[PDB]
Amino acid sequence: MHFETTKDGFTIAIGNRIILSHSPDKPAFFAGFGEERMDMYRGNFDIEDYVIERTALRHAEVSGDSVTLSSAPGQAPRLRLTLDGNAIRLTALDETINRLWLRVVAETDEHVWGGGEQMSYFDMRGRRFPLWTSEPGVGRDKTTEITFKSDVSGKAGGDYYNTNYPQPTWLSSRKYALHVETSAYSVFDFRNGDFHEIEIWAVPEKIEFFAGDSFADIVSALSLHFGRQPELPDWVYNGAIIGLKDGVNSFARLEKIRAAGTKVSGLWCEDWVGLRQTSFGARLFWDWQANDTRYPHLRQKIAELADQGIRFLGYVNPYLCVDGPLFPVAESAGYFATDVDGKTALVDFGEFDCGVVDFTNPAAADWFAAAIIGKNMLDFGLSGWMADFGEYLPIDIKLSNGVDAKLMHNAWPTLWAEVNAKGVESRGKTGEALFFMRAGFTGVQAHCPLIWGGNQSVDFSRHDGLVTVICGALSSGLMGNAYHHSDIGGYTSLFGNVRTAELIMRWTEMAAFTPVMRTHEGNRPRDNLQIDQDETVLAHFARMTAIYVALAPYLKSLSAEAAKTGLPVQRPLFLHYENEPQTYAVQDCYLYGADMLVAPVWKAGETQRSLYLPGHGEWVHLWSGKRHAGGRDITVETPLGEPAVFYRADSSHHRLFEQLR
Numbered sequence: 001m002h003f004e005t006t007k008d009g010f011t012i013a014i015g016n017r018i019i020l021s022h023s024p025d026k027p028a029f030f031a032g033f034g035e036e037r038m039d040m041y042r043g044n045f046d047i048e049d050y051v052i053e054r055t056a057l058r059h060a061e062v063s064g065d066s067v068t069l070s071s072a073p074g075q076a077p078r079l080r081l082t083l084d085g086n087a088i089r090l091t092a093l094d095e096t097i098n099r100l101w102l103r104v105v106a107e108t109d110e111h112v113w114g115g116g117e118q119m120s121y122f123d124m125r126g127r128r129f130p131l132w133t134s135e136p137g138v139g140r141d142k143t144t145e146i147t148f149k150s151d152v153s154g155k156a157g158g159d160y161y162n163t164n165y166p167q168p169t170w171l172s173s174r175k176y177a178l179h180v181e182t183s184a185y186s187v188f189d190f191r192n193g194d195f196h197e198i199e200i201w202a203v204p205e206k207i208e209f210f211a212g213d214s215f216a217d218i219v220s221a222l223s224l225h226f227g228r229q230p231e232l233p234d235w236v237y238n239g240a241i242i243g244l245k246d247g248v249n250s251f252a253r254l255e256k257i258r259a260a261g262t263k264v265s266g267l268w269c270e271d272w273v274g275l276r277q278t279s280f281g282a283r284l285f286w287d288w289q290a291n292d293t294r295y296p297h298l299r300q301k302i303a304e305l306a307d308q309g310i311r312f313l314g315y316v317n318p319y320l321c322v323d324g325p326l327f328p329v330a331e332s333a334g335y336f337a338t339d340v341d342g343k344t345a346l347v348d349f350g351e352f353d354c355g356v357v358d359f360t361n362p363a364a365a366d367w368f369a370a371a372i373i374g375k376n377m378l379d380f381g382l383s384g385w386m387a388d389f390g391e392y393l394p395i396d397i398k399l400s401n402g403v404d405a406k407l408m409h410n411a412w413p414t415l416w417a418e419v420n421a422k423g424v425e426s427r428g429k430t431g432e433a434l435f436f437m438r439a440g441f442t443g444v445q446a447h448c449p450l451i452w453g454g455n456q457s458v459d460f461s462r463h464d465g466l467v468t469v470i471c472g473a474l475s476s477g478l479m480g481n482a483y484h485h486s487d488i489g490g491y492t493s494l495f496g497n498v499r500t501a502e503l504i505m506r507w508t509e510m511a512a513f514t515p516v517m518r519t520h521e522g523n524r525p526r527d528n529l530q531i532d533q534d535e536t537v538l539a540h541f542a543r544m545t546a547i548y549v550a551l552a553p554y555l556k557s558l559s560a561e562a563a564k565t566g567l568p569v570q571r572p573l574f575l576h577y578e579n580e581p582q583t584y585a586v587q588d589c590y591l592y593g594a595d596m597l598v599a600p601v602w603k604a605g606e607t608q609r610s611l612y613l614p615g616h617g618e619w620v621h622l623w624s625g626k627r628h629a630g631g632r633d634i635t636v637e638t639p640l641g642e643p644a645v646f647y648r649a650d651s652s653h654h655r656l657f658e659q660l661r
């Protein structure tokens, strides 16, 4: 990167792209001090800053191979800037600073994407995005009654910016990416036309830059920096992972699903550990071993299923309930985070308390990986699991490494991902065992093989329904997570919001053109329609699983590309159609690899779908074989069973796509 003096200050560029511009009248950096409030209630945070100082660093001077910045001439410098390859390193010279703002040069028509897994807005331009892992919210839109009710009853509605997986990384339409190396609270402010502003509640070690001739090349570079995932295991291609939580009755319902012709790769029973009924619904018993009361012959059932070519998956998270038998084992070994007095810190998860396994203590992390992931899960015969949570570290607890919980909070999902990966690696099953996370932060990419979109409401809402999954996939894919999926039919049923047949079927239609089809009974299984309970829904589901299986050779080539190049399986239109600027904000269609275009129906009652077909070639409608020229809007019929999916006539996979007609 290139530092250049000007009349009154300096610029820093990557290539011909100016990134920072400083003068006394238009400073690049501001420094100061704040006292935050961050109140936690069941993984929801009410965050408010009290800024005591925000002071422009107007005065720059060269000092060896660095620049120092002070408030004004004749004042002691507060910040040092040092160029180091593709990074700007920052050193706090005034050790009182706990707030830093940095302005980066922006253009009027510029788009910015990333920010981790964003659930509402893909193109972040025009809005402000705090980056703090938490519950994403139920409803996530202060104008909906679901959100309002969630806020009033449990401070749980959230808003457009909340996510289980924030990351302080952006990709700019100017063909560079920026990454802030920090775990502190930070904010991306894209409200101004002429600059982007980053707020950090720390002076980060460095800010790193990635450039390239194409967006694809920059995503490759990012994925190499954060780490790539293994290829999907071959067993996944046998069909859907059926999610049931009905104890021994799960087996009979699976047989019913199978009798309809459904292609099944796995049975996922999150209640393998037992249930705990709460006011929220049928939650799980958070003690990570097979529960003989709920599944008295589970090991035998796993072997029966294996003989039928079906794997078995469970559930785990990084907390232990106080009333479970593992809790005193962990407490006795000193493996829990502590409170200010050195006692085990108890966290309320909603009508039950848990200890937090302290992964900053290497012995605790090793115990979790060896005893739970290794012995209780993999050695018990699980091929995979939901690896849940990560987003709830309160900021008033004490960690074994002595690092403030305010800094460890965002790091937690990555530490948790690493515990899972180490367990898997200790059994030689990297690339074969499949665990999936909803929570993330910088670095989760290297350890987690598959993301899921967390809890959507069981609806077609704009800010917590079906369509938000696509936003999540697109954003997280640019950040180097190649594989994304969602709960078919959503999760959260509260305040009378329950599934419909149509919702399930539309969600299944999308899921068949993603890496993994997986169902979930949700928080209130008997209040919500499940895939086995309606003949039409089940037959539609079976058919969609057959389509997914017929498409597996294509999906498998996309997984190979993901390993070779880092490119996500679900890509935004602009990644392959860079010279069509009007595509740059599209977030409800994706390219499934380079050769298929998918435009999910995300509203009730729709019989048709309108969308933009890009490029100058031909697109072939998957169900009819009708060809259409690229470069225009079209409207196609989308009855249930026939989502709006097209393939490139030029595709090397055309013979396969022709089969689906």
Ligand SMILES: O=[N+]([O-])c1ccc(O[C@H]2O[C@H](CS(=O)(=O)O)[C@@H](O)[C@H](O)[C@H]2O)cc1
Binding pocket: 042, 043, 270, 280, 282, 283, 284, 285, 349, 350, 388, 438, 454, 455, 491, 520, 522, 523
């Ligand atoms: O705050 N809550 O009450 C809360 C409840 C459920 C939550 O969902 C998470 O945890 C569920 C298990 S459990 O119900 O908390 O035991 C799983 O079935 C979901 O797939 C997962 O996303 C997450 C949070």
Ligand SMILES: [Cl-]
Binding pocket: 494, 495, 496
């Ligand atoms: Cl309710």
